[PDB]
Structure 1
Amino acid sequence: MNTVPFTSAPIEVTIGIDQYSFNVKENQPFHGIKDIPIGHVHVIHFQHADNSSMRYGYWFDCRMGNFYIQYDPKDGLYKMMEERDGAKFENIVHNFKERQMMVSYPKIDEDDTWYNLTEFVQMDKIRKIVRKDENQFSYVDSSMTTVQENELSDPAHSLNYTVINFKSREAIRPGHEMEDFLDKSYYLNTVMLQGIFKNSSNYFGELQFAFLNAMFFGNYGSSLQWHAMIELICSSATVPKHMLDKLDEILYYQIKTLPEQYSDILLNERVWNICLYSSFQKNSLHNTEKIMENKYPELL
């Protein structure tokens, strides 16, 4: 069980650590988060009480280094940093724990939610989508645009998701214009899975990371990517059975966790109605269709 200490909390902020959040008051004696489960990526996340605009945060994996948060009064945000002195870090953490100045990652034993939301998400792939090679952790915020969004403006601050475009030369074979557009199986299985992602685990990891960026930061371009990756599968007549079964589980937990009052800005009516009711896979997502119909029947 690992720890992310905070130097201090000088500005009032709502701090998130995966699906959980807590409020910290201006200059409250908060010194970090302990008991973070090892084995998963995690995201710490912030929203200034004064500026609910620009929610931002950091994806990290405590197996890759010792990380802490420190507020920067010049750039006006909580920054993640790596501590290279292991003994200084262990000493910092042990003192803050002795003084009980840390919140505990509040995992219920029964609860597999975070695992289910991050099953295929790996730090190494996160760091290829979010390019800042000098750090072991990755910053994301509400306003960052995607490579594909930039094609329709600072490349260093971009989300390099795999570009998916159903009316492209990559998606369509010459002489199969109709076949490939109406049944996207060759684009899914040959172009994307065999060619680009290499396996379905990497595809699902990017889909899961896009969703989490969309849900945690409202990154519009992340939301576009999540829906595009769902639609590419649902619009393919030929999908391995194990991928359909896993997608149904992936989406079930995403819909379950999705906060109710942001449903209208996180779920695209057209994609979900098409996927659940018109597509080739309309009858292959039983768990997801059941939760959607019982939680968000308005959208449908």
Structure 2
Amino acid sequence: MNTVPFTSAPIEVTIGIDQYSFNVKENQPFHGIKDIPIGHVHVIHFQHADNSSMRYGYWFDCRMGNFYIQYDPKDGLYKMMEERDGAKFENIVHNFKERQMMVSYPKIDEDDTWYNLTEFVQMDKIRKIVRKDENQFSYVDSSMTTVQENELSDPAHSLNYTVINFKSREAIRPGHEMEDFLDKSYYLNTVMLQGIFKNSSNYFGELQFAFLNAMFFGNYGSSLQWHAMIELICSSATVPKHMLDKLDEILYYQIKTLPEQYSDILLNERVWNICLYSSFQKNSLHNTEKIMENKYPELL
């Protein structure tokens, strides 16, 4: 069980850790989060009390180093930093643990939610989507645009998701125009899975990371990517059986975790209705269809 200490909390802020959120008051004696489960990526995120504009946060894995948070009054945000002096870090955290200045990662023993949302997400793949090689952790915020969005403007600050475009030469073989547009199996299985992602685990990992960035930061380009990666599978007549079953589980837990009040902005009516009721896979996502119909029957 690892720890992300805070130097201090000089500005009032809502702090999220995975699907949990809590409020810290201005200059409240707060020095971090302890008992963070080892074995998963995590995200620590922020929304300032005075300016709800810009949710921002950091993806990290405590197996890759000792990380802490410190407020920068010049740039006006909570920054993640790495501590290279391990004895110093341990001594700081111990002091703070003995003074009971740290909140506890509140995982229920029965609860597999975070595992289910991050099953295929790997820090090394996050760092290829979010390019900042001098750090072991990755910054994301509400406003970052994707590479695809930047084609239709700071490259260093982009989300480098795999570009999916159904009306592109990459997606459409010459001489198979109708076939490939109406059945995207070629594009899914040969171009994307065999060619670019190499396996379904990497595809699912990017899909899961896109969803989490949409949900936690309201990142619009991430929501577009999530829906595009769902639609590419549902619009393929030929999908490995284990992929369909896993996709059903992935989406079920995403829909389960989504805040009921954000469904208007985070769910695309056309994609979901096509996927659940028209596509080749309309009968392959039983768990997702049941939770969608009971939780969001208005969208459908």
What is the TM-score of this pair, normalised by structure 1? 1.00
Give, in whole Å, the separation in 2 of the partners of 1:221 and 1:110. Answer: 33
Shift of 1:230: 0.0
Deviations 1:216-273 (A, max 9, x none): 0000000000000000000000000000000000000000000001000000000000
- CA-to-aligned-CA distance 1:60-107 (integer Å, 9 cap, x gap): 000000000000000000000000000000000000000000000000
Coordinate RMSD, CA, aligned: 0.2
Map 1:129-144; keep pairs closer than 5 Å. 129-144=129-144
1:289 Cα deviation from its structure 2 partner: 0.1
Report SS of the residue matched to 2:148. helix
Once residues 156 and 184 of structure 1 are traced to their aligned partners in structure 2, the CA distance between those partners, rounded to angstroms, is: 32
CA distance in 1, matches of 2:167, 2:46: 38
Query: How much does 1:143 deviate?
Result: 0.1
Q: Map 1:232-243 to 2 at 5 A.
A: 232-243=232-243
Per the alignment, in what secondary structure is the counterpart of residue 79 of structure 1? strand
Displacement after TM superposition at 1:210 (Å): 0.0
CA distance in 1, matches of 2:30, 2:244: 44
CA distance in 2, matches of 1:256, 1:22: 20
Partners of 2:258 and 2:181 in 1: how far apart?
Answer: 31
CA distance in 1: counterparts of 2:11 and 2:158, whole angstroms: 27
Q: Deviations over 1:119-160 (max 9, x none)?
A: 000000000000000000000000000000000000000000
Q: Could you give the per-residue CA deviations for residues 171-229 of structure 1, whole angstroms, max 9, x where no partner exists?
A: 00000000000000000000000000000000000000000000000000000000000
In structure 1, distance between residues paired with 2:95 and 2:270? 53
Give the Cα–Cα distance (whole angstroms) in 1 for the partners of residues 38 and 243 of structure 2. Answer: 27
What aligned pairs does 1:261-272 form with structure 2 within 5 A after superposition? 261-272=261-272
Match of 2:162 in 1: 162
Paired residues, number: 300
Distance in 2 between residues matched to 1:264 and 1:231, nearest whole Å: 19
Residue of structure 1 equivalent to 2:9? 9
SS at match of 2:95: helix
Helix, strand or coil at the partner of 2:84: coil
C-alpha separation between the residues in 2 aligned to 1:267 and 1:287?
A: 17
Measure the CA separation in 2 of the matches of 1:180 and 1:29.
Answer: 59
Distance 1:155 1:212 in 2: 22
Structure 1 runs, 4 residues or longer, greater than 2 Å off: none
Which whole-Å CA distance do the structure 1 matches of 2:264 and 2:176 have between them? 36
In structure 2, the residue corresponding to 1:147 is in which secondary structure? coil
Task: Give the Cα–Cα distance (whole angstroms) in 1 for the partners of residues 63 and 266 of structure 2.
Answer: 31
CA distance in 1, matches of 2:81, 2:270: 41
Q: CA deviation at 1:49?
A: 0.1
Cα offset for 1:113?
0.1
1:212 is aligned to 212
Aligned-residue offset at 1:33: 0.2
How far apart in 2 are the matches of 1:251 and 1:24? 32
Query: Deviations for 1:259-300, whole angstroms, at most 9, x for unmatched residues?
Result: 001000000000000000000000000000000000000000
SS of 1:78's equivalent in the other structure is: strand
TM-score, normalised by the number of residues in structure 2: 1.00
Match of 2:87 in 1: 87
Partners in 2 of 1:264 and 1:10 — Cα distance? 34
Cα offset, 1:41, TM superposition: 0.1
